[PDB]
Amino acid sequence: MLRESLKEYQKISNQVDLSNVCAQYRQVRFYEGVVELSLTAAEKKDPQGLGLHFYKHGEPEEDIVGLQAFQERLNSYKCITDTLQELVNQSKAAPQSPSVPKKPGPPVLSSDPNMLSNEEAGHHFEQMLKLSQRSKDELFSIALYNWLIQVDLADKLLQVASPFLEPHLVRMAKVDQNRVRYMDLLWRYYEKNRSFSN
C-alpha cells in the first residue's frame, strides 16, 4: 500500500506538498518513497536539464532560468537530505551531543530487542543512502556529495564509486574558499583509486 501510494503521488509530483508527504513517509518509516518521490519531484520540474546545464557552464548570474531550475531541483532533493540528516541526528546522538536538549539523551541503552533507535536509525540511514546511491541524477549526486561533506561523512563520500565525484572535487578545489578540504578529499580519492601519480 506504500508502493501503491507512491505511484499516485509520482503521477502528480509537480503539485505535491513534498515536505509534508516525505514527513508523512518518515512517520511510517517509508524512506524508499522519500528517495523516489523527491527525485520524481525534481525530474518533472526540470525535464530539459536546465539546472544541470547552468551548473556545467559555470553557475552564471545572467541565467535566471537555469538558476531557478537549479534551485527548484535542490528544493525537491532537500526532502532526501533533511531525512538523511534526521537519521544521522538520531544515530550519532549517543556518541556525541545528544538531541532533545540538556544532558540526558532520548533513547535507556544497556538492554534491547536486538535493534533500537540508534541502531535502527543507523540501519535506515545506510539503507536510504544505499537507495540514493542508485540515482542517475548528476545534480542530485552533487547535492548528496555536498551534504556528505557538511555532516563529516568523508569516509562515505569515499564509498561512492561514481564518475560525477572527480569532476565535482575538481570544481570545488577552484571555487570554494575551503579549497584545502577539496584537495584533501581529492588526493584521498586518487590514492584509494590507485591513481598515485595524480
Binding site: 509534508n20 514527513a23 508523512q24 518518515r26 512517520q27
Partner: protein, 149 residues
C-alpha cells in the same frame, strides 16, 4: 456536560445538571448570532475555573475550533451557594474571528489546557506536526473587555 455536588464537606454525592452538545451549540449560536454552528462542536475539553480565578464562573469548555465556552453553576456573587444549574454565560472566539484580522484560526484542536486565564492548545498542521497555541491576558490583566496576547 454534567455537574455533581460532592457535598460542602467533599464527602457527599449528587448529580445536579446535564446539558447536551446540541443544546450548548444552540445556546452559543443564539449568543454569537453571526457565527456558524459548526465551531461550537466537538467540545474537546472541559476545565475548572478555580475559586481563586472567579466567583461568578466555575467551568470552561473548549472546541476543535478554539472557541471558549464559559459556564456558571451557581448564582452570581453568592460564593457559599451549592451548584443548581449549568448556564452558558460567555462565548469567546479565538484569534482570526475579527472581520479585519490577518491572523489565522485554531482548527483540528485535539488537546486544550486552561488554568488562571492562560489557554494552551495543540492543533495539527499537517498530520506529522502540531502547532502549540498560547493565549492569555497577563499583559492586559485589569482591562474590560478582556484583551489578550
Amino acid at each position: 456536560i454534567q455537574v455533581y455536588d460532592l457535598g460542602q464537606d467533599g464527602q457527599g454525592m449528587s448529580r445536579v445538571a446535564s446539558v447536551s452538545q446540541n443544546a450548548i451549540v444552540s445556546a452559543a449560536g443564539n449568543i454569537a448570532r453571526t457565527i456558524d454552528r459548526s465551531v461550537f462542536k466537538p467540545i474537546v475539553q472541559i476545565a475548572v475555573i478555580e475559586n481563586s480565578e472567579s466567583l461568578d464562573c466555575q467551568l470552561l469548555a473548549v472546541t476543535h475550533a478554539g472557541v471558549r465556552l464559559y459556564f456558571s453553576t451557581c448564582p452570581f456573587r453568592q460564593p457559599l451557594a451549592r451548584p443548581n444549574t449549568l448556564t452558558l454565560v460567555h462565548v469567546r472566539l479565538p484569534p482570526g474571528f475579527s472581520a479585519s484580522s490577518t491572523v489565522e484560526k485554531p482548527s483540528k484542536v485535539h488537546r486544550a489546557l486552561y488554568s488562571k486565564g492562560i489557554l494552551l492548545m495543540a492543533a495539527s498542521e499537517n498530520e506529522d506536526n502540531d502547532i502549540l497555541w498560547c493565549v492569555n491576558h497577563d499583559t492586559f490583566p485589569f482591562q474590560k473587555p478582556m484583551m489578550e496576547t
